[PDB]
């Protein structure tokens, strides 16, 4: 096997030109699509805002049309999913991870229009879901679509173009090239066996979708938080403590998200009409809360800059947290199309901010700025629930651009993964694949 | 299928003892890296102090510059040729082998050989990095604690070997991410599944970085300040720069490999012809580290200067050619020390050059050569050693210019794509292949 290694080493990093070229066309499409989806969601949130202006008087009539708009659009989304593609409910990342393990089908002719138009409805209604879910899955299917449409043969081409699709999916979702590529090679890939994923092609895919994203979304960052202060060495231990707190909370949240899937499954019992209507009830509650306390609803991207700057009070933070936990669950655990990735950044910031405030007054000799703890806490729920720290840390870094906080960010994150391990919690994306993969064997 | 459900529910569960031991590994790797760093500094300093004591008599100084660097070079080649030939050159090839179980990790030998050997070659002002020394020493450190605590199992053997190499690169460039990313893009067994625990690699890198910051706070290794932005209609220029790195990446590999061979004849495997030839090269370094310091040394000094566009076109072209020469002679002669660093240096100097031509050609783009300098910095690492994701993240971590991320990726990927289609090979695999093939031949 040594002579085999000398044979292999001399032949490393040689991807077939056709796989590379097709990775490029995958990215391009994934990007344009993500960009389109992004704009669709925006347009709808905007129309909905335009209705509340047409009924800006009559207070109850406003609260009504806020509900009904988000109700109808949510219902429309749940339906498009329940009716034509049940695999494209919830996130979509569980499924694409399965698809890489050959354990799941990539029914693109179905999912693409279902996730797209479905997400358009759930997200555009102002529900507490991300864009990653939609774009990552849509991304994978797009990579599947071009695999089929061009009839590319082999394991390499099937895993790679499925992976790069997912990568360009996350990348065009957060303007985060690195986080995309890192996500694949830390989470997306078959975690227990060797695979035929070409990293170089994943890149080209991510590149293309980022370029497509920058073409249409130049000169406005997703999160602008400005350059925060530094973190002195004798401060570091406070980030460990913060991580520990995220560590014990990470799995606790996974119980809630899993259990709430079950608790909400009874309200409809797998019935299309009970579901669609239940969905429109949650959806409407979001467009309602996106008026009476917008911090509780929506994707979450709005409250991040505000929280980091320390413009929220301790009360308001605690309230934002509690109510977001609620609305994050109700939206995701009810299997509506949309990622959990984003509202998890929101919850992490809000917690980090809170811990930072307490830190600030307790240690005035440290000259703390809560916002550093807000940025350390940002990717921490990602490292404690999803258990992908290297993705979460690089995701944060790419969006907040505070590299001087690299150490506190790593330390918090690693503390969250180490304590999410020792409190018996599971990678929330595996856990749902295992529930889905087990529930398919458990009907035989 | 049912095996997968069993595995998924059991993912990311590293034995606490592997975690705990990864933490100690880092700590040691770091303190050692820090120590080595300081040693090299101390010696570069003493050698500066000698040139002061003979600051008059011109040929007398040129001589004492040679002799200091000669002697300390010879001392290094000897400590390697005599007690651990595996710790010559980089050391990264060996540790990669070590993870493939195709090479032994003789820490009782290499630790003090690489350490004090590097101290000699580096401290003499030779064109070698600190990565080589620290990465290898790092792995061996992880081996040492594996042995000394008798930790059993593949996981423990590969993990503590990897995190050692990771905490090795990490405290080498103050670059935590580049460390972890290097393991999972290059260092790992590239063709089969392995038992490396990422979570534990982290803890290791963390600890070595904390060790590095405790002794090296408040001074960055490269300070280039915040450069300008890169407009979208500029991007194609970084593709072209990448392509140019792509064609040169393999050509450089030929010369590094071929120059190992051409230098092997001057000694023929003979300890005395070797150690004296080594002192001849070493002495040429301390000499050039006086008559044109930009041609000699680790290279870290010319980067900030190059990026700001303080070098002329002539001076750049000369620093390039002369550095190609001195980089080869020092690494290809199997002296202990990484090639990682002088590869960044080469990349910056080329990038800057490309940027200057760019600036005058397209005044409507409002270019700043220094953006192309930072795009070119990790590019040689993506074309010679074919680890772009590590090279990009390494540069980003050292330069802090995240707004140049696209140019950086585009150049890098252009370098990897064109180093593939001009038949070049990952220079760290190519050396492992040479060493592993020369073992059965």
């Amino acid at each position, epitope marked *: 096997r040594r002579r085999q290694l000398i044979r292999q080493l001399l032949e490393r990093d040689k991807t077939p030109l056709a796989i590379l070229f097709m990775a490029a066309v995958v990215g391009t499409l994934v990007g344009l699509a993500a960009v389109a989806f992004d704009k669709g969601v925006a347009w709808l949130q905007n129309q909905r805002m335009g209705a509340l202006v047409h009924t800006a008087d009559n207070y109850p009539l406003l609260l009504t049309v806020a509900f009904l708009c988000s109700a109808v659009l949510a219902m429309f989304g749940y339906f498009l999913v329940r009716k034509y593609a049940p695999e494209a409910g919830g996130s979509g990342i569980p499924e694409i991870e399965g698809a890489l393990e050959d354990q799941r089908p990539v029914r693109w002719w179905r999912v693409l229009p279902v996730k797209f138009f479905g997400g358009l409805g759930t997200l555009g209604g102002g529900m507490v879901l991300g864009r990653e879910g939609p774009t990552v899955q849509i991304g994978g299917n797009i990579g599947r679509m071009v695999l089929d449409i061009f009839r590319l043969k082999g394991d390499e081409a099937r895993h790679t173009l499925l992976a790069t699709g997912a990568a360009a999916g996350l990348a065009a979702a957060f303007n985060a090239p690195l986080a995309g590529i890192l996500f694949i090679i830390e989470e997306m890939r078959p975690q227990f066996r060797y695979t035929l994923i070409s990293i170089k092609a994943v890149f080209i895919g991510v590149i293309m979708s980022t370029i497509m994203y920058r073409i249409f979304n*130049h000169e406005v960052a997703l999160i602008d938080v400005g350059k925060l202060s530094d973190a002195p060495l004798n401060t570091l231990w406070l980030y460990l403590i913060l991580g520990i707190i995220f560590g014990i909370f990470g799995p606790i949240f996974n119980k809630w998200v899993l259990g709430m899937q079950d608790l909400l499954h009874r309200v409809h019992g797998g019935n299309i009409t009970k579901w669609v209507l239940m969905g429109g009830a949650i959806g409407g509650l979001c467009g309602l809360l996106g008026f009476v306390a917008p911090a509780t609803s929506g994707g979450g991207f709005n409250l991040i800059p505000i929280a980091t700057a320390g413009n929220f009070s301790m009360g308001m933070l605690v309230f934002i947290f509690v109510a977001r936990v609620i609305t994050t669950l109700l939206c995701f655990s009810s299997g509506a199309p949309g990622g959990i990735f984003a509202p998890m950044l929101a919850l992490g910031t809000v917690l980090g901010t809170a811990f930072g405030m307490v830190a600030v007054e307790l240690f005035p000799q440290y000259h703390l700025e809560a916002g550093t703890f807000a940025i350390a806490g940002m990717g921490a729920l990602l490292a404690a629930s999803i258990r992908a720290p290297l993705t979460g840390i690089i995701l944060v870094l790419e969006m907040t651009d505070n590299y001087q906080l690299i150490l506190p960010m790593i330390i918090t994150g690693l503390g969250a993964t180490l304590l999410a391990q020792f409190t018996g919690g599971k990678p929330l994306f595996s856990a749902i694949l295992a529930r889905t993969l087990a529930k398919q064997e458990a009907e035989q | 299928r049912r095996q997968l459900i069993r595995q998924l529910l059991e993912r990311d569960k590293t034995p606490l003892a592997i975690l705990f031991m990864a933490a100690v590994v880092g700590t040691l790797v770091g303190l050692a890296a820090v120590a080595f760093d300081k040693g090299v500094a101390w010696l570069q300093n003493q050698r500066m102090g000698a040139l002061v004591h003979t600051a008059d008599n011109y040929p007398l100084l040129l001589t004492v510059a040679f002799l200091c660097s000669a002697v300390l070079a010879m001392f290094g080649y000897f400590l390697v040729r005599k007690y651990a030939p595996e710790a010559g050159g980089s050391g990264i090839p060996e540790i990669e082998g070590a993870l493939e179980d195709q090479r032994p990790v003789r820490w009782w030998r290499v630790l003090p050989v690489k350490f004090f050997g590097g101290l000699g070659t580096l401290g003499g002002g030779m064109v070698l990095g600190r990565e080589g020394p620290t990465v290898q020493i790092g792995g061996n450190i992880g081996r040492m604690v594996l042995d000394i605590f008798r930790l059993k199992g593949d996981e423990a053997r590969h993990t503590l070997l990897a995190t050692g190499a990771a905490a090795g690169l990490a405290a080498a460039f103050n670059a935590p991410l580049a460390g972890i990313l290097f393991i999972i893009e290059e260092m790992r067994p590239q063709f089969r599944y392995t038992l490396i625990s990422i979570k534990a690699v982290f803890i290791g890198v963390i600890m070595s970085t904390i060790m590095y910051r405790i002794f090296n706070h408040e001074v960055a290794l490269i300070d280039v300040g915040k450069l300008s932005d890169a407009p979208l209609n500029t991007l194609w220029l970084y593709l072209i720069l990448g392509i140019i790195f792509g064609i040169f990446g393999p050509i450089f590999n030929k010369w590094v490999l071929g120059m190992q061979d051409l230098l092997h004849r001057v000694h023929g495997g003979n300890i005395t012809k070797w150690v004296l030839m080594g002192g001849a090269i070493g002495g040429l370094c301390g000499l050039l580290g006086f008559v044109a310091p930009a041609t000699s040394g680790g290279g870290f000094n010319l980067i900030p200067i190059a990026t700001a566009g303080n070098f002329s076109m002539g001076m750049l072209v000369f620093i390039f050619v002369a550095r190609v020469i001195t980089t080869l002679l020092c690494f290809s002669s199997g002296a202990p020390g990484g090639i990682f660093a002088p590869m960044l240096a080469l990349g910056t100097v080329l990038g800057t050059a490309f940027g200057m031509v760019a600036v005058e050609l397209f005044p*409507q783009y*409002h270019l700043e050569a220094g953006t192309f300098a930072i795009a070119g910095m990790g590019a040689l690492l993506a074309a010679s050693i074919r680890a772009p994701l590590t090279g990009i993240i390494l540069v980003l971590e050292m330069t802090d210019n995240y707004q140049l991320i696209l140019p950086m990726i585009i150049t890098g990927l252009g370098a990897t794509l064109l180093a593939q289609f001009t038949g070049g090979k990952p220079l760290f695999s190519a050396i492992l292949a040479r060493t592993l093939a020369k073992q059965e031949a």
Partner: antibody
Amino acid sequence: VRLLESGGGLVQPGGSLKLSCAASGFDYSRYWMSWVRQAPGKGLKWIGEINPVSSTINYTPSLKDKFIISRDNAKDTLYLQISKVRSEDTALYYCARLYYGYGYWYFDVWGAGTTVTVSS
Amino acid sequence: DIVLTQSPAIMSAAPGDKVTMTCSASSSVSYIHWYQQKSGTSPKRWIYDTSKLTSGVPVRFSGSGSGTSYSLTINTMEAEDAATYYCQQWSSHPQTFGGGTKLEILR
């Protein structure tokens, strides 16, 4: 964001004057500045431009030291020295902050302009 | 340097009219710009990269074209639109402005 250029007024033909532009509301580094002028009742003409670290400074088809564009970043201020002043330099001088969309640059926020009259 | 010459030197139209002025160039220019200079005021970056509107420009304004010919259209003109408009390129150094189309209102 305000560009408030001053220093204009009366000059005697052949002499020289230093215009200043004082900026406030944006990081005065990071931006390329420019000078555009407007002779009375006529269109717009590009005088020159200057990057942040004063390392590149292009002028328009002028002469030797006809125009000279400096900038004291420590004062958030842009300067323009016009020497050997003939009466084509009787104009309104806008200091303007420069920026790009896709990449082909434009003149972003414009100042009020100062008036320069060249007469005896 | 590129010479841009602008269609009507001066034009008159009653509000509610659809109005297009033209910017023609000596060579090939791409992603040009437009400035609005209302009377006794400094110009305002009005349209940029051939088609994008600056932030706070009514959606009644549009812009298009490529190569030699460019336009700016006010679809249903308003009387508050009375200015002189300048086109400017910097696709080729040095940047060069247009001659100015001057919109007059017929009331």
